[PDB]
Structure 1
Amino acid sequence: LVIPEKFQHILRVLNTNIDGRRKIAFAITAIKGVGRRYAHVVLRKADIDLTKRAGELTEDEVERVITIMQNPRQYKIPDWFLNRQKDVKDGKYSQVLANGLDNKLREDLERLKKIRAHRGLRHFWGLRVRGQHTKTTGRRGRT
């Protein structure tokens, strides 16, 4: 329950963005390595208590699921929630860390720009790579 001190409103855990107003399946999803079915499988394989709440969370719990995100090969599950899966720069599913160095961090997008990949050109805009018949098309990519 709440105690007469600071609630876990705004803190820097893993440089992610989350505010304590939306409930479960949304708070865990705020970190790009936790949420939905992957959260289900992690909570299963780690044998975790259902009652635990994220309202006053501990950093270790999110970190451990993130470590599982880095290395899900042993678990025999899709290493999903990664934009870097089977992509250049990782010999094996590796975790890149830190922010403010996005160009270096996501150099995958720089590799896609230097090869001028239309697929890569898709990222940065909201549109279909296939491009459907002339109609409400093109509107995909509004800034």
Structure 2
Amino acid sequence: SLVVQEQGSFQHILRLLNTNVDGNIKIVYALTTIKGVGRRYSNLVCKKADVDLHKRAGELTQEELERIVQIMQNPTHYKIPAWFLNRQNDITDGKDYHTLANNV
């Protein structure tokens, strides 16, 4: 494609949800680094956030990190239904949880 070149402006290692993320992989496979989040989960989250996933995680603005975190604490409000989450139909609360990385 078109070689879109950036004069610096990317950070090597970002940190999100209290966990270090390498800002050089694709954003799916850079957010796969944290616990409780796999390939298809980060993929569907960034498709609901409309993130270009052929772009690396160094070329990602923190506003999209805020969007990804908003889908983290709101998966069921952003049209990602109950089959896709970690703890569906709990016994303690009866709800559907997606247990995050450092909150296990």
Alignment of 1:30-69 (within 5 A): 30-32=33-35, 34-69=37-72
Distance 1:90 1:68, change over 3 A: farther
The alignment's TM-score, normalised by the length of structure 1, stands at 0.44
CA contact (8 A) 1:20 1:55 kept: yes
- Assess if the C-alpha contact under 8 Å between 1:33 and 1:69 holds in 2: no
- The CA distance in 2 between the partners of 1:77 and 1:63, in whole Å, is 22
Greater relative CO (CA pairs within 8 A, separation 6+): 2
Partner Cα distance (2:46, 2:23) in 1: 21
Q: Which amino acid aligns with 1:31?
A: I
Supply the RMSD in Å over aligned alpha carbons. 3.7
How far 1:8 sits from its partner (Å)?
0.9
Hey, what does 2:22 align to over in structure 1? 19
Instruction: Identify the residue that residue 28 of structure 1 maps to in structure 2.
Output: 31
Other-structure match for 1:78 = 83
Structure 2 unpaired stretches of 5+? none
State the shift of 1:91 in Å: 6.5
Q: Report how many aligned residue pairs link the two structures.
A: 96
User: Structure 2 residue aligned with 1:3, among 1, 7, 24?
Assistant: 7
Instruction: Report if the CA contact (8 A) 2:76-2:82 is conserved.
Output: yes
Contact residue 16 and residue 31 of structure 1 kept, 8 A: yes
The separation in 1 between residues aligned to 2:40 and 2:49, in whole angstroms, is 14
Gaps of 5+ in 1: 100-104, 107-143
* Partner Cα distance (1:10, 1:49) in 2: 19
Whichever of the two has the greater Rg, that structure is 1
Give the TM-score normalised by the residue count of structure 2. Answer: 0.54
- Secondary structure at the aligned position of 2:29 is classed as coil
Using the alignment, how far apart are the partners of 1:62 and 1:91 within structure 2?
26
CA contact (8 A) 2:36 2:99 kept: no
Offset, 1:3: 1.8
Give the number of the structure whose residues are more often strand, by fraction.
Answer: 2
